[model samples]
Target: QFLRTDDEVVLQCTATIHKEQQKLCLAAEGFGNRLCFLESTSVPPDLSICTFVLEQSLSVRALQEMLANTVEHRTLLYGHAILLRHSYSGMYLCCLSTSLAFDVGLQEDTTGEACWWTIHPASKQRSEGEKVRVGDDLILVSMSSERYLHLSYGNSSWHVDAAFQQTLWSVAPI
Candidate 1:
């Protein structure tokens, strides 16, 4: 499963971001699902880690419902981008430019178009574990540009790719 109610998930960088180790997570409290990072270990259950829910509407009521209860709804036929923070660095994954046609960048705060992302489920598998196999390859779509997130060769930088096939990313629960 892409997201589980009772479990916390981590967004590992299959490609490179600004930091050496990039993991997307959530802080203990916030106005939104502000993401944070946790390297090499599990997060405390009390701390709200990252989880996902799909909604047909972008209405306030829909958002409020998703935020209020996410564990019960895990299969996302559609996607949405909430701000994700780098736990140790205090940065956000965003677009590098003001317009939608731009490269992806890490920002200090969630202020511009780059802050939001829409995550789509990939067809590939992520694990072969006894009890924890996920149909992996989650594709991150930028809400601003409507482009897919792509990791360039050699893990150099992040950019928006017009091609959907090159944008697959493996998401695993940490």
Candidate 2:
């Protein structure tokens, strides 16, 4: 859970789709803002040592567009970092939402907070993970694909597209 706010935590923020009327959308605090972030934790993912970040809608659109024309060749997106989950139990990425410290949604002083982001794997190739809620801040934790759990207020409350992850990446070793 420390991955979301702690500077040492590594998380990636990825947005799949944005809807206004809660139409098959990933439930989050700032879902109405049409802006979201994905962050990775200290642990790696289960599949391989590669994780990606695709925020540009053009890339997503291009992927959907190219999904129809591709016959032999395959395309890959730019991964922000390499992730490795310790167990083969299977790993997944989850979307967590919370209110910002300044926002009235969070009553406590969230000057510093941390949390984790869980992922789930489905049978399909693009299977999505379950939606988990932390506090007002969200962090991307790359943990072993062993147990799936959700936490809140342990260290921080995830914000609605808050600065928790952004603040960590500010000094992340690039």
Candidate 3:
């Protein structure tokens, strides 16, 4: 069975940007779903925790310019079958499947930006990954040239002018 509500979901953020050329740790306890990612900044620009469950969709991108840095923006869906899209120079899209575990990373620097996403079980991961079992934990670590990054976790909220953005995007099937 997969989680189908945000109430059963939890999210977390990095305390501070990576001060040193080191690693930052994050974990999601219990059974559910976990999505890990890396970008120049935190979600929503407001820096808040973002949680995801089954029948939900997420859209985020890292837009970078040589002078400035990286910016992340994301949108969510409360129902099944959602579209994740982003464009800087061209169109990028991903069809999020329900109850599938996946992880992807995007980097935009002096050159340009790139985004990647997947929907597969944790048992087969490209990088550091974990299984989505009961009482299990999901951990993610990411660093960039700035040596500083933002982390956030929480259910979705729209109390502010801008809604809470989500970095770690995950959805479980009910």
* Candidate achieving the largest TM-score: 1
Whole-model Cα lDDT of every candidate shown, in order: 0.44, 0.23, 0.25
Sort order, TM-score high to low: 1, 3, 2
- lDDT, candidate 1, residue 25? 31
Residue pairs whose backbone atoms clash in candidate 1: 5-71, 25-36, 35-85, 37-87, 81-117, 95-114
TM-score of each: 0.46, 0.19, 0.21
lDDT of 2 by residue, 1-174 (tens): 111211121232222223321111112122233222222333322212222221111233343354446555111112111221111112222222433221111111111111222222222332222222232122222221212222212233232333222221111211
TM-score of 1: 0.46
Residue-by-residue lDDT tens digits, candidate 3, 61-151: 2222331353341222221122222222112222122211222221222122222222223223532222233322222221121111124
Task: Write out the backbone clash pairs for model 3.
Answer: 11-153, 12-152, 12-153, 13-151, 13-152, 14-151, 17-149, 49-153, 49-154, 50-154
Q: What RMSD does each model have against the real structure?
A: 10.1, 18.4, 16.1
**lDDT score for residue 19 of model 1:** 56
Best by lDDT: 1
